[PDB]
Symmetry: C2
Subunit: 170 residues, 2 copies
């Protein structure tokens, strides 16, 4: 569907680094600590929030290239045998390529690798302010499996919470 | 307070391995996924649950030895500079030494190391079935900061959830 896919090579390092993982959102998932647990609620934000990030057999990176020779996206995966978890360390699609099936195809490639390793599930972390990726993950078969409100304390993302999502591996 | 404390040496490996990290509990924290979030509720369990486990500058292990020459307890810590987090990887006290101040002293030693590294917080993971460690952590200055319901899927601990607790570092 207009893209080429392969395992990354050292020469992809620059394009991976340069790829624009930034996004603008009209909503965020507000995380509330209730004492007994946590609640998430999608809330509107005005003005829209623009988030800019200042970014071996069990590990793998898959890249997606467009017709133009430009990197459309990548996914970095890591496998842990103790809990048979394939961690999606990072997944990013160039803003122009968003909503063109790149993310879904890369996640499918991540799923195939998980199956090869005999994974029981796929797992990912996503900032609570990334409402579009959260909704996109939900529509790829993932559901909220946890969170860490302290993950970003003392970082450039202080005030955000890490949200955890998982999918059983077919 | 009856114990000796130091940094571990290779020769402590056997005693660390052999130390009994098992526990019996009359209660557990039941984790409920509400869809919008998670709730934790301490519930009684009958019969009592007995849990048996089939167990470099930023990493460190501190040991506590009793008068008898036996290992009373240990704490394994790891530091991550990106979020200035000191992770308490593992902490275990021999059942006879429980409630004698060993855990508190080891956690204090973990806190001093965190300060030396310039940590902003201390962090730990604890199984939801470990109601006594959860209550002990709460009484050491930690509070629930998250959880991962999928951490133990496909393991010997399947059915348990990982609970995350943090403390700001003085």
């Amino acid at each position: 569907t207009a893209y080429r896919y392969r395992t990354s090579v050292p020469g992809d390092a620059e394009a991976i680094e340069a790829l624009d993982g930034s996004f603008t959102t009209d909503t965020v998932f507000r995380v509330t600590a209730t004492g007994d647990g946590f609640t998430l609620r999608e809330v509107p934000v005005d003005p829209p929030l623009t988030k800019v990030f200042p970014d071996d057999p069990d590990s793998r990176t898959f890249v997606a290239y467009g017709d133009d020779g430009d990197l459309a996206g990548f996914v970095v995966v890591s496998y842990s045998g103790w809990n048979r978890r394939l961690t999606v360390e990072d997944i990013e699609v160039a803003p122009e390529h968003r909503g063109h099936g790149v993310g879904r195809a890369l996640m499918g490639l991540a799923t195939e690798f998980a199956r090869e390793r005999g994974a029981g599930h796929l797992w990912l972390e996503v900032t609570n302010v990334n409402a579009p990726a959260i909704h996109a993950y939900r529509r790829m078969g993932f559901t909220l499996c946890g969170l860490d409100t302290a993950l970003y304390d003392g970082t450039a993302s202080d005030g955000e919470q890490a949200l955890y999502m998982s999918m059983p591996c077919p």
